[PDB]
Amino acid sequence: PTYQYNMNFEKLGKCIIINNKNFDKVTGMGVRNGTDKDAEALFKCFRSLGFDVIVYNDCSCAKMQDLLKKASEEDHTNAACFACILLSHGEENVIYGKDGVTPIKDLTAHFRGARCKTLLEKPKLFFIQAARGTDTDANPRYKIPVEADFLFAYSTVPGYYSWRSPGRGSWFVQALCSILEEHGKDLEIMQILTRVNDRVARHFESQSDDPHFHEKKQIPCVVSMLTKELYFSQ
Amino acid sequence: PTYQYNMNFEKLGKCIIINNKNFDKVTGMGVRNGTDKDAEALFKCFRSLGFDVIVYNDCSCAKMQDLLKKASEEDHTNAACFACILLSHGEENVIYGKDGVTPIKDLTAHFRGARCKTLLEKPKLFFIQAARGRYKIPVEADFLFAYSTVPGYYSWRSPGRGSWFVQALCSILEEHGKDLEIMQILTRVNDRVARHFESQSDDPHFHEKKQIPCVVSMLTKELYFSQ
Numbered sequence: 173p174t175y176q177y178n179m180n181f182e183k184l185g186k187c188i189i190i191n192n193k194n195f196d197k198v199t200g201m202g203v204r205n206g207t208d209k210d211a212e213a214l215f216k217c218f219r220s221l222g223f224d225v226i227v228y229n230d231c232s233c234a235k236m237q238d239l240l241k242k243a244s245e246e247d248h249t250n251a252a253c254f255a256c257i258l259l260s261h262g263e264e265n266v267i268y269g270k271d272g273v274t275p276i277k278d279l280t281a282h283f284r285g286a287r288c289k290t291l292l293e294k295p296k297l298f299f300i301q302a303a304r305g306t307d308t309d310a311n312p313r314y315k316i317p318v319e320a321d322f323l324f325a326y327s328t329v330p331g332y333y334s335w336r337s338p339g340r341g342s343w344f345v346q347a348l349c350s351i352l353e354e355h356g357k358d359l360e361i362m363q364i365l366t367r368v369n370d371r372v373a374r375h376f377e378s379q380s381d382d383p384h385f386h387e388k389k390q391i392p393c394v395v396s397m398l399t400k401e402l403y404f405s406q
Numbered sequence: 407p408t409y410q411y412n413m414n415f416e417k418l419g420k421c422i423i424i425n426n427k428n429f430d431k432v433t434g435m436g437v438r439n440g441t442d443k444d445a446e447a448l449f450k451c452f453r454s455l456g457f458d459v460i461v462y463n464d465c466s467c468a469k470m471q472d473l474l475k476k477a478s479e480e481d482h483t484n485a486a487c488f489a490c491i492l493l494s495h496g497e498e499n500v501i502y503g504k505d506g507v508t509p510i511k512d513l514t515a516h517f518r519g520a521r522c523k524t525l526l527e528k529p530k531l532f533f534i535q536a537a538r539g540r541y542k543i544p545v546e547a548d549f550l551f552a553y554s555t556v557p558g559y560y561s562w563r564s565p566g567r568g569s570w571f572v573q574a575l576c577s578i579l580e581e582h583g584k585d586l587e588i589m590q591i592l593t594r595v596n597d598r599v600a601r602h603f604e605s606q607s608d609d610p611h612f613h614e615k616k617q618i619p620c621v622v623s624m625l626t627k628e629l630y631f632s633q
Contacts, residue, residue: 264542308546310499310543310544311499311510311543311545312543312557312558313620314556318556318618318620320600328545362590362593362623365623366626366628369547369624369625370626370627373547373626389519390545391546391624391626392624393622393623394621394622396593396620396621396623397596397618397619398596399593399597399600400593400597401593
């Protein structure tokens with residue numbers, strides 16, 4: 173209890189959702205079908221958790237940057253924590269805007285104590301569902317502001333198939349939401365996210381020798397600098 | 407239940423401890439005093455958790471590579487998990503051998519799912535303590551890294567005692583090691599070294615060095631060293 177973040181605040185905090193579905197053809201990236209379904213789930217889910225959710229769509233690089241900076245400049249004094257979720261295309265250390273590419277570390281750095289005193293000693297959660305596109309990544313969180321109270325959940329797992337409407341949705345993202353609804357108010361985040369890792373990991377039906385399940389195995393990556401346990405409830 | 411790793415085996419598992427204190431001149435690196443304090447602290451600690459701890463000192467890059475290559479090649483059918491602890495100098499995805507540098511991905515390379523079936527589905531723990539300052543260190547299921555600083559940072563202590571990180575880990579483990587889940591333990595460590603920080607020096611035109619341990623997790627279940 174002196175081992176978990178103080179959640180006795182006016183409000184839980186803000187939850188920013190960047191939903192990037194469409195991209196300029198100059199980037200070579202295609203439509204991210206299924207992203208809308210993830211967005212829909214996430215916002216409903218975090219809303220339920222008690223977050224004040226904002227959803228942005230098809231943002232430019234400048235758009236994402238000004239977006240987060242401004243947020244890192246608001247007064248988070250009456251908030252317990254802060255959450256940001258990025259849904260787009262990604263390449264080692266980068267995420268796509270519709271017009272180009274920006275480094276994730278710049279997107280998150282805005283919230284480092286130095287430049288956001290109002291969220292000091294407060295958990296800052298980043299859930300990224302990027303994925304190379306149209307054998308995993310690295311760990312040295314250098315493409316992340318290594319500072320206390322920061323937590324990243326990077327996917328990279330692709331939303332592989334999809335006919336359409338409402339689309340199936342990304343695995344990682346749907347797992348997250350599913351668990352976060354059923355247990356959002358009982359489990360600690362690392363519990364939530366560990367259950368998530370497992371769930372997407374199982375989607376690759378173990379190590380099947382069947383020429384139908386043989387593929388690029390992937391799993392989310394959880395990076396924690398949290399200094400206390402995180403519960404969203406009472 | 408199906409939410410925690412199955413610890414029902416004869417042994418907890420192997421725990422290799424690489425303790426590189428002295429380095430050849432050709433690397434331009436200096437003695438890591440206090441790492442012997444760390445190494446021992448870590449030994450009695452992990453040994454007490456239940457690991458079969460073996461410590462190796464001032465290893466060469468070749469030595470560390472082979473050391474871990476052989477470990478992966480052993481039979482872990484009666485093991486619940488595996489754990490490697492590295493104490494040394496580091497810069498990024500690479501740690502220091504006593505005769506040069508070797509990257510991290512290589513140490514964990516031969517443990518990936520396919521390459522070590524016996525340890526498959528079971529947790530491979532890596533506790534790293536690098537300092538000072540190849541590439542990409544993969545992301546496989548059931549691996550967990552606990553970096554002392556973060557690829558290319560600092561870690562300090564008190565002339566006579568080991569790193570704050572190590573000391574924190576041993577103290578917490580040597581107290582809740584058997585009742586708290588791995589992530590809890592590590593979080594408290596994160597908090598412990600935090601409190602120790604944002605120091606006093608007096609060359610305000612030199613004192614930068616900070617520190618926040620960090621935990622990369624690909625675990626698929628909760629981890630307890632008990633039951």
